[PDB]
Design a protein around this ligand. Structure first.
Ligand SMILES: C[S@@+](CC[C@H](N)C(=O)[O-])C[C@H]1O[C@@H](n2cnc3c(N)ncnc32)[C@H](O)[C@@H]1O
Length: 258
């Protein structure tokens, strides 16, 4: 349903490959590997740690976490086709698991994870479901555990222009303000809630990706089509414009159970 809408539109096999082209190998979100190194730079884990990755995509985040720390990583993603692709990217590693499932219906034991991690996935959930998810994350975290999130956010809806409204509507995103997001975490009883508006950094990542796209247009055209190139090009152009004026925002959130 939600699954079908995602698999048949934004995340068809080709759509995913187009994203991987611009974001980088094994990634379908902002800044690919380099942004991941920075997001995890102050996170401490080891070979005994258990990590959940919500919306694991092609699995680059789980791969990086397992490589850097030796941690057990479990990725959940609702799109079966994406999970099938993820499974082809990893072999012979019994500490990386990818599972096709809606995170909203997945069950895990209480006090299970040292880190719950999610990069640009929760924007797909309705506001009601964001709240439900974070209650679940709260239960699933170990007492000593950490929640680490980046997600698409936005200025107040009253401020949105026609083009942005249409962007959000077509993708069926639910974009709230960085402040509202932080309030949800606080309402779910997370402690030490830190929220950062990383829109300027996001804007930097977009500009690099955009330049890469232009410089590799010939290769892109061979792999895909000019029509897909124009759509992607225009799409990044708008994100660059809208992040610059803070209409579309990139939020970072870190919190703890205790
Ligand atoms: C930004 S893309 C993948 C991001 C991935 N974390 C990365 O950085 O490469 C967002 C992902 O969230 C997944 N997703 C959306 N709703 C979901 C849900 N309810 N449960 C699990 N995954 C979901 C989508 O299938 C998609 O793969």
């Amino acid at each position: 349903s939600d699954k079908t809408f995602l698999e048949n539109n934004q995340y068809t096999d080709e759509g995913v490959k187009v994203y991987e082209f611009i974001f980088g190998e094994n990634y379908i979100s902002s800044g690919g590997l380099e942004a991941t190194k920075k997001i995890l730079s102050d996170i401490e884990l080891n070979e005994n740690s258990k990590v959940l990755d919500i919306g694991s995509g092609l699995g680059g985040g789980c791969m990086y976490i397992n490589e850097k720390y030796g941690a057990h990583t479990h990725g959940i993603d609702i799109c079966s086709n994406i999970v099938n692709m993820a499974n082809e990217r990893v072999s012979g590693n019994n500490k990386i698991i990818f599972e096709a499932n809606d995170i909203l219906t997945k069950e895990f034991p209480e006090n299970n994870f040292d880190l719950i991690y999610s990069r640009d996935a929760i924007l797909h959930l309705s506001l009601e479901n964001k709240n439900k998810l974070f209650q679940k994350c709260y239960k699933w975290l170990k007492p000593t555990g950490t929640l680490l999130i980046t997600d698409y956010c936005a200025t107040e809806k009253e401020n949105w222009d026609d083009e942005f409204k249409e962007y959000v509507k077509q993708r069926k995103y639910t974009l709230i303000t960085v402040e509202e997001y932080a309030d949800i975490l606080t309402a779910c009883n997370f402690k030490n809630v830190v929220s950062k508006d990383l829109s300027d950094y996001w804007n930097q990542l977009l500009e690099v990706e955009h330049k890469y796209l232009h410089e590799n247009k010939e290769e892109f055209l061979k792999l895909f089509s000019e029509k897909k190139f124009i759509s992607l090009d225009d799409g990044w152009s708008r994100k660059i414009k809208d992040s610059k004026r803070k209409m579309q925002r990139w939020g970072y959130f870190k919190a703890t159970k205790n």
